[PDB]
Paper text:
Eukaryotic SOD1 is a 32-kDa homodimeric metalloenzyme containing Cu and Zn ions at the active site in the active state. The Cu and Zn ions are bound at the active site by loop IV, whose conformation is stabilized by the highly conserved intramolecular disulfide bond between Cys57 in loop IV and Cys146 in 8th β-strand (β8). Eukaryotic Cu, Zn-superoxide dismutase (SOD1) is primarily responsible for cytotoxic filament formation in amyotrophic lateral sclerosis (ALS) neurons.
Aspartic acid mimics cysteine-sulfinic acid in terms of the electrostatic charge and the atomic arrangement. This result indicated that the metal-bound SOD1 was crystallized despite the small portion of the metal-bound form in the protein sample. The metal-containing state of the C57D/C146D mutant SOD1 adopted a similar overall structure to the wild-type SOD1, with an RMSD of 1.311 Å between the protomers (residues 2-153) of 152 Cα atoms. Charge repulsion between Asp57 and Asp146 appeared to induce conformational differences in loop IV in the overoxidation-mimicking mutant. In the mutant structure, the arginine residue is disordered by lacking the interaction with disordered or displaced loop IV, as observed in the hCCS-complex structure.
Author numbering: -1 to 153
Amino acid sequence: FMATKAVCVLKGDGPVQGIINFEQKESNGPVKVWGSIKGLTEGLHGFHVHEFGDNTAGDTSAGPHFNPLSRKHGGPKDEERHVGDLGNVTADKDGVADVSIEDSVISLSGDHCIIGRTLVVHEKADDLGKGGNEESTKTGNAGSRLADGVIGIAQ
Ligand SMILES: [Cl-]
Ligand SMILES: [Cu+2]
Ligand SMILES: [Zn+2]
């Protein structure tokens, strides 16, 4: 089987929630990521795929950012990045982040497959590895998880 579409329902302990859609018509092509997230503070919020689709214990059970190539944290456009580094979503004045992303590193098939893994929206902006500290090189200093969910097959 080869997934062409995926979906992730994001939920948390507070007001943050949303639906994220993934589309990839070609196995060797980019993934379109689109949807909306509500209940956010206005501004930038870190947006990452973590390694495991698990919250057995909590944040640790989702593991670090998905990182099959053993690289350091960066932005989605950087050559040096984790596969799960999708950068930041932007929330407007009403707390709605309209997500519109095209990425060529994540995939719905193969070694970079994100199906069965966890998508997370964070409290703070992702510094893209440019924060000048150790945490920047791992998480981008995006802080706590406001909402998460496991990425499932949709088509
Ligand atoms: Cl760029
Ligand atoms: Cu994260
Ligand atoms: Zn990362």
